[PDB]
Amino acid sequence: SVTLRLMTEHDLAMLYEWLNRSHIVEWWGARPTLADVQEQYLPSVLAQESVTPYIAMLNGEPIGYAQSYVALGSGDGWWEEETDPGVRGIDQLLANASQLGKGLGTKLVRALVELLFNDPEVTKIQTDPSPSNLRAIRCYEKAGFERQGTVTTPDGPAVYMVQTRQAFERTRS
Ligand SMILES: CC(C)(COP(=O)(O)OP(=O)(O)OC[C@H]1O[C@@H](n2cnc3c(N)ncnc32)[C@H](O)[C@@H]1OP(=O)(O)O)[C@@H](O)C(=O)NCCC(=O)NCCS
């Protein structure tokens, strides 16, 4: 089973290594220096953009990184049409290339979705994989997200996917 813990400052050097692995570099929104990671992913810095970092754990070992964010609190250009403060967005990665395509990502996303719905004010979860990122799209579908359509983001077009609280209630059983 995959669990999630808050990321700390002590995880930054580890995250730096992960973010420079080829399987991560090709998708993650490119090759950050250690200083880049320390300056941008420090939990208190991410907090300023309403972003919460997590480390995914499996059998006592860190296996991935995830982020949740309040869409309404995102930076300029991001989710500019949003009006609901209950909307959360997610992003995630698996650290080890050998562990890709084995269902661990789906387990990670499911764990993150459950955590977020334990915030009573949360109404809906969104994700924004790029159209080219078909593996991520299928992962989110397996985790209970539904493709809505194409949206323009500051990083380019994305396949906008959502999972509502009601949908989670009906499938969690
Ligand atoms: C996205 C990510 C977290 C998904 O985790 P994962 O464990 O690899 O995904 P899962 O094994 O749970 O599911 C992958 C699904 O995608 C499918 N798939 C893989 N490549 C595909 C492709 N090119 N086209 C269509 N489907 C594809 C697999 O068949 C599998 O579905 P299945 O169970 O029906 O066979 C992981 O691949 C990852 O960290 N990728 C690199 C970073 C990244 O892309 N981050 C997300 C950015 S939005």
From TrEMBL:
It catalyses: kanamycin B + acetyl-CoA = N(6')-acetylkanamycin B + CoA + H(+). InterPro entries: Acyl_CoA_acyltransferase, GNAT_dom, N6_acetyl_AAC6. GO terms for molecular function: aminoglycoside 6'-N-acetyltransferase activity. Keywords: Acyltransferase, Antibiotic resistance, Plasmid, Transferase. The gene is aac(6')-Ib. Residues 2-166 form the N-acetyltransferase domain. Signal peptide: none annotated. CoA binds at L94, G101, G103, G105, T106, N133, R138, Y140, K142. The keyword Ribosomal protein does not apply. Homodimer. It holds the Pfam family Acetyltransf_8. This is Aminoglycoside N(6')-acetyltransferase type 1. The keyword NAD does not apply. GO terms for biological process: response to antibiotic. It comes from Salmonella typhimurium. Its EC number is 2.3.1.82. It comes from the Bacteria. SUPFAM superfamilies: Acyl-CoA N-acyltransferases (Nat).
